[PDB]
Design a protein around this ligand. Structure first.
Ligand SMILES: NC(=[NH2+])c1cc2c(I)cccc2s1
Ligand SMILES: [Ca+2]
Length: 223
């Protein structure tokens, strides 16, 4: 996250870190046994870490659970990143408490202008590499599809939306992939892609979760 701030330990209780020997993507806990993240974060051998704040230090509120299975969306296209969402089932059901909570799925899509909260342990420099050990947060509004489409002509589908600042400066970045974009208490997006980080006229692009709620609900009830 570039131009964001330290969240504070366990203030984003639904945030997850996917680890395959190191942190590689973020994710969201939607219920005791399931996590949603980005399909481009797909890896075999994932361990989900809940109640994290500093990922290099065991502070006492963590739960490390291995995934029993991963389901990438049936129509995910790794070339355009269209339908960049994946569900991960845990081997054991997590113990929810004040530091580990699930986020709710949306009932409808959000409007351009709605302010959202984006969080993750990704890179914090636009030009450079600086990886934080504590969670970073960023408040950013959803942008209109027109400004999203003009920034990225022929690359935006109806399953993607942009959020951020066209002037640059604040944005999600690599290492944040799979993480949550929560607006009004609902998980509305997943960190998917962008052209560099915090660049001017290059906002972040997020998976539009409101379009996958039936697929998520149907898939988790059958697995
Ligand atoms: N501009 C952005 N918000 C992003 C940039 C990236 C990059 I570069 C890699 C992976 C994910 C993301 S999100
Ligand atoms: Ca830790």
């Amino acid at each position: 996250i570039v131009g964001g701030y330290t969240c504070g330990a366990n203030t984003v209780p639904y945030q997850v870190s996917l680890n395959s020997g190191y942190h590689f993507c973020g994710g969201s806990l939607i219920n005791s046994q399931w996590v949603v993240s980005a399909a481009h974060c797909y890896k075999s051998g994932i361990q989900v870490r809940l109640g994290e704040d500093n990922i290099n230090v065991v502070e006492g509120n963590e739960q490390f659970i291995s995934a029993s299975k991963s389901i990438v969306h049936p129509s995910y296209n790794s070339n355009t990143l269209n339908n960049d969402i994946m569900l991960i089932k845990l081997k054991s059901a997590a113990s929810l408490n004040s530091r580990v909570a699930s986020i709710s799925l949306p009932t409808s899509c959000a409007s351009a202008g709605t302010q959202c909260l984006i969080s993750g342990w990704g890179n914090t420099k636009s030009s450079g590499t600086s990886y934080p050990d504590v969670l970073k947060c960023l408040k950013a509004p959803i942008l209109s599809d027109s400004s999203c489409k003009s920034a990225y002509p022929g690359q935006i589908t109806s399953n993607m939306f942009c959020a951020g600042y066209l002037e640059g400066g604040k944005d999600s970045c690599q290492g944040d992939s799979g993480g949550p974009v929560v607006c009004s208490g609902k998980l509305q997006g997943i960190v998917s892609w962008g052209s560099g980080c915090a660049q001017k006229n290059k906002p972040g692009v997020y998976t539009k979760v409101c379009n996958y709620v039936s697929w998520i609900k149907q898939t988790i009830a059958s697995n």
